[PDB]
Amino acid sequence: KTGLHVHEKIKHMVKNYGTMITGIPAEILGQNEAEISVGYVKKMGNMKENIAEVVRKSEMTQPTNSAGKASNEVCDLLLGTEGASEFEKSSYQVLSGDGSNLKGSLPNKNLLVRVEMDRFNAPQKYQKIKREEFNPETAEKNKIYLLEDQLVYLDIFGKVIDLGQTSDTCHRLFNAITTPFYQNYILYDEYIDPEESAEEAAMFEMGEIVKAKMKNIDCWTATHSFTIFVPESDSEDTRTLYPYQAYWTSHTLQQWFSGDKDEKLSRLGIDGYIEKLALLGTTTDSKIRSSIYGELFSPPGKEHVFCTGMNEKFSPLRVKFKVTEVNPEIALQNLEEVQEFIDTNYPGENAKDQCELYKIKAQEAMTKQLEMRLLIE
Amino acid sequence: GLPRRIIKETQRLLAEPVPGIKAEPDESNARYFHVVIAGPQDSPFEGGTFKLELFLPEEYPMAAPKVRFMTKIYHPNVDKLGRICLDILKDKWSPALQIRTVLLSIQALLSAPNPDDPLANDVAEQWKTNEAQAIETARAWTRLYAMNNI
Amino acid sequence: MQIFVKTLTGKTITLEVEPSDTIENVKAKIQDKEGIPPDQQRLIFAGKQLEDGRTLSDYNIQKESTLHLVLRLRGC
């Protein structure tokens, strides 16, 4: 029971069953999917034909593309329900500029590392306001507030955070921004040139001040989550990594394995995949960070168009991780258990036929639930 | 009372237009833009001229521009009213973006249509299930609506 | 106030939130509860998409309401 035994088992089971890997019965899927799709069924004419059409066009058995959900489903199988809940209680550890912290957190045993990457969600626009009118329990949040004697940041929670500016400095910037369109405007507009007018120079100076103080404030929000699997090998440099992931409105974990991207990421090496991932959090280059962010997180094949144009990752990025050893005697026992539950409730020769039987039962329970609901006109 | 950037953005759009996109402000509403996007090559819209009307709201640039097709088009992310389902005009619009970025997206959206909910849009289901015939539909709508309409 | 968040797979969770908090705050509490990133979330409140920069004091949301978290999105 090697670590590459379980890696190949999840790889073929996810490639062939998809949502069935979660263990949820088809009846519950169709019952809850009817809750979302009830507003699309037509109410006139033959109701059996109206319900059948919406039932046919639903993607309820399509695997999830929530990156955080695919990471949860991988942890439940390899670690077990209780082991994964204990794993969640642990905290993440930020990666440094060279990824040495993760490089040292990988002993030569079977390991599972979950990665939570955050995007810097710094505020993008300000507002002049008199202190009389400033109620921090009602005013718009994640915004810079320039008062006549204080420049302050309202975070995402309610907390007011001073930016260390003199009352005289704030009085100068307050009375310099005078045009009505700029009293509630953005901080870093590219068309604002400080050499044109004295008003715009004060806006640009305010941007440089906010951009400096925001570096010491926690403004990160999670933008992606994935999973990496490290099997136990006879060391040397026969050590390999295999990352698991899905992505919002992009691809599923089933498509991830089907495209063999976990293997294009494999032979990149232990230190190779880590060095380029620490790279991603360091560089300020805008057109030379999206290349990586696509190189590791795109659907299989489209590593060259995943981060272009407006999807071009501008904001700074951080990556975090946490590790725990896996016991293959329990992981494979959890996997063949789902194979047993699948082969029992929905048996068949081909795995493609076992999925068809699961789709029909989900469509049957969704149908009966829909016609019961639509009896109210 | 035109804001200074909307003035600056208009002059940039007229000095270096996006290749294949004609964008000019209205003679009476400087916040209103008349857009003509040419059909990309290697696409069922090739050879077509599609009219769009972009309006810069008053919250612009803190809010995304309101754009919408005026020519009938068979696209999975454009409904019957002409609304373009893009990730900019919805939630993740940022002040770093601008008009040219929006125009470039819509042009890129014609070449690479996105997946969509097959419900409340028979065009999206037809593109996912019967692509070759949905592409055949778009070539018909391009000759009927997007040719000799300027 | 306690509100409930449901998924397609029937998994219902409990949150501690109050009418003053926003959607990003609700999605942030979902991150600490299920490990889901907010950028990978978009929650429906009875056929109503919940935008990022709006509070609970603006969607007629009240105490003990079942919010519908979708985990598969196609388009926009």
SS (H, E, C) C11-63: CEEEEECCCCCEHHHHHHHHHHHHCCCHHHCEEECCCCECCCCCEHHHCCCCC
Nearest to A88 among C6, C24, C35 (CB): C35
Q: Are residues A259 and A344 in the same domain?
A: yes
Any C CB within 8 A of B129 CB: no
- Diameter over CA atoms, chain A: 79
Q: What are phi and psi of A217, to 5 degrees?
A: -110, 140
Instruction: Please answer yes or no on whether C75 and A249 come within 8 Å at the CB atom.
Output: yes
- Å between C61 CA and nearest CA of chain B: 20
User: Structurally, how many domains does chain C consist of?
Assistant: 1
- Å between B148 CA and nearest CA of chain C: 31
Q: Are residues A40 and A96 in the same domain?
A: yes
Q: Copy the structure tokens of residue B28.
A: 């009476």
Domain range spanning residue B103? 1-150
Instruction: Please answer yes or no on whether A191 and B3 come within 8 Å at the CB atom.
Output: no
Q: Which of C4, C40, C67 should be substituted to probe chain A, the one whose Cβ sees the most A Cβ atoms within 10 Å?
A: C40
Instruction: Please answer yes or no on whether C36 and A68 come within 8 Å at the CB atom.
Output: yes
Residue from A3, A77, A7 nearest A328 by CA: A3
C-beta pairs of B13-21 under 8 Å, 24+ apart in sequence = B13/B99, B13/B100, B18/B100, B18/B103, B18/B104, B18/B107, B20/B107, B21/B103, B21/B107
To the nearest 10 degrees (0 to 180), the angle between helices A328-345 and A3-17 is 30
Q: Are residues A3 and A101 in the same domain?
A: yes
Domain range spanning residue C6? 2-70
Query: Would C75 be classed as within a structural domain?
Result: no
The CATH number given to whatever domain includes residue C43 is: 3.10.20.90
Q: Are residues A290 and A253 in the same domain?
A: yes
User: Structurally, how many domains does chain A consist of?
Assistant: 2
Any A CB within 8 A of C16 CB: no
Q: Compute CA distances A202 → A188, A195, B3, whole Å.
A: 12, 10, 17
Q: What are phi and psi of C69, to 5 degrees?
A: -90, 120
Q: Are residues A177 and A59 in the same domain?
A: no
Q: What is the DSSP track for A269-306?
A: -HHHHHHHHHHHHH---STTTHHHHHHHHSPTT-TTTT
User: Structurally, how many domains does chain B consist of?
Assistant: 1
Q: Are residues A18 and A133 in the same domain?
A: no
Q: Which of A310, A313, A315, A366 should be substituted to probe chain B, the one whose Cβ sees the most B Cβ atoms within 10 Å?
A: A310
**CA dihedral of B136, B137, B142, B144, whole degrees rounded to 10:** 120
Domain range spanning residue A246? 1-121+220-377
What is d(CA C39, CA A274) in angstroms, rounded to the nearest whole number? 23
What is d(CA A36, CA A39) in angstroms, rounded to the nearest whole number? 7
Q: Which of A41, A58, A191 should be substituted to probe chain B, the one whose Cβ sees the most B Cβ atoms within 10 Å?
A: A191
**CA dihedral of A356, A361, A363, A365, whole degrees rounded to 10:** -170
Q: Are residues A334 and A231 in the same domain?
A: yes
Catalytic residue positions of B?
Answer: 85
Among the three residues A183, A204, A219, which one is the final residue of a domain in this structure? A219
Instruction: Please answer yes or no on whether C34 and A72 come within 8 Å at the CB atom.
Output: yes
Residues of chain A contacting residue B76, judged by C-beta atoms under 8 Å apart? none
Resolution expressed in Å: 2.8
Q: Copy the structure tokens of residue B128.
A: 């996912």
Residues of chain B contacting residue C42, judged by C-beta atoms under 8 Å apart? 91
Q: Are residues A286 and A357 in the same domain?
A: yes
Any A CB within 8 A of B101 CB: yes
Among the three residues A200, A219, A238, which one is the final residue of a domain in this structure? A219
| Amino acid in the structure at residue B96 | A
Q: What is the DSSP track for A155-208?
A: -SSS-EEE----HHHHHHHHHH--SGGGTT-BS--TT--TTT-HHHHHHHHHHH
